[PDB]
């Protein structure tokens, strides 16, 4: 049914509408195939204490 | 003592084997029927199958 509705919308929507529907679906697939992330990360500094002289 | 434990285990294994076999047949028949049902359901014109 989703097909049916999309097709109807697409038809009214014209060719351009199917085209980009294809693109974002492709977006989804591409994401699916490669779903990963990362973070640059900037490490924090560890600390220690020294006794400063007078 | 040991023998009894062993015997019970043996029965346990066989029974489970039977259960397993039953389950498999049931699934196969289930999918079977599901197939037929889906095919019938396709009565909603070919947009349905698509």
Swiss-Prot record, chain A:
Induction: Expression increases approximately 3-fold upon entry into G1 phase compared with other phases of the cell cycle. Also induced following inhibition of mitochondrial protein synthesis by thiamphenicol. It is found in: Mitochondrion inner membrane; Nucleus; Cytoplasm; Cell membrane. The mitochondrial prohibitin complex consists of two subunits (PHB1 and PHB2), assembled into a membrane-associated ring-shaped supercomplex of approximately 1 mDa. Interacts with STOML2. Interacts with MAP1LC3B (membrane-bound form LC3-II); the interaction requires PHB2 and takes place upon Parkin-mediated mitochondrial damage. Interacts with STAT3 (unphosphorylated or phosphorylated at 'Ser-727'). Interacts with CLPB. Interacts with CD86 (via cytoplasmic domain); the interactions increases after priming with CD40. (Microbial infection) Interacts with SARS coronavirus/SARS-CoV nsp2 protein. This is Prohibitin 1. Widely expressed in different tissues. Belongs to the prohibitin family. It comes from the Eukaryota. The modification Phosphotyrosine is found at residue 31. Protein with pleiotropic attributes mediated in a cell-compartment- and tissue-specific manner, which include the plasma membrane-associated cell signaling functions, mitochondrial chaperone, and transcriptional co-regulator of transcription factors in the nucleus. Plays a role in adipose tissue and glucose homeostasis in a sex-specific manner. Contributes to pulmonary vascular remodeling by accelerating proliferation of pulmonary arterial smooth muscle cells. It comes from Homo sapiens (Human).
Curated annotation (Swiss-Prot), chain B:
Transmembrane segments: none annotated. Residues 1-38 form a coiled coil. The modification N6-acetyllysine is found at residues 36, 50. Expressed in myoblasts. Phosphorylated. Tyrosine phosphorylation is indirectly stimulated by IGFBP6. It comes from the Eukaryota. Induction: Expression increases approximately 3-fold upon entry into G1 phase compared to other phases of the cell cycle. Also induced following inhibition of mitochondrial protein synthesis by thiamphenicol. It is found in: Mitochondrion inner membrane; Cytoplasm; Nucleus; Cell membrane. Protein with pleiotropic attributes mediated in a cell-compartment- and tissue-specific manner, which include the plasma membrane-associated cell signaling functions, mitochondrial chaperone, and transcriptional co-regulator of transcription factors and sex steroid hormones in the nucleus. In the mitochondria, together with PHB, forms large ring complexes (prohibitin complexes) in the inner mitochondrial membrane (IMM) and functions as a chaperone protein that stabilizes mitochondrial respiratory enzymes and maintains mitochondrial integrity in the IMM, which is required for mitochondrial morphogenesis, neuronal survival, and normal lifespan. The prohibitin complex, with DNAJC19, regulates cardiolipin remodeling and the protein turnover of OMA1 in a cardiolipin-binding manner. Also regulates cytochrome-c oxidase assembly (COX) and mitochondrial respiration. The mitochondrial prohibitin complex consists of two subunits (PHB1 and PHB2), assembled into a membrane-associated ring-shaped supercomplex of approximately 1 mDa. Interacts with ESR1, HDAC1 and HDAC5. Interacts with ZNF703. Interacts with STOML2. Interacts with ARFGEF3. Interacts with SPHK2. Interacts with COX4I1; the interaction associates PHB2 with COX. Interacts with MAP1LC3B (membrane-bound form LC3-II); the interaction is direct and upon mitochondrial depolarization and proteasome-dependent outer membrane rupture. Interacts with IGFBP6 (via C-terminal domain). Interacts with CLPB. Belongs to the prohibitin family. LC3-interaction region (LIR) is required for interaction with MAP1LC3B/LC3-II and for Parkin-mediated mitophagy. This is Prohibitin-2. It comes from Homo sapiens (Human). The gene is PHB2. The chain holds residues 201 to 250 of 299 of the full protein.
């Amino acid at each position: 049914k989703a097909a049916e509705l999309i097709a109807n919308s697409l038809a009214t929507a014209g060719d351009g509408l199917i085209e980009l529907r294809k693109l974002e679906a492709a977006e989804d697939i591409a994401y699916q195939l490669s779903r990963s992330r990362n973070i640059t990360y900037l490490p924090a500094g560890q600390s220690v204490l020294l006794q400063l002289p007078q | 003592q040991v023998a009894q434990q062993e015997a019970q285990r043996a029965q346990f294994l066989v029974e489970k084997a039977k259960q397993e076999q039953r389950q498999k047949i049931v699934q196969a028949e289930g999918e079977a029927e599901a197939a037929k049902m889906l095919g019938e359901a396709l009565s909603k014109n070919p947009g349905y199958i698509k």
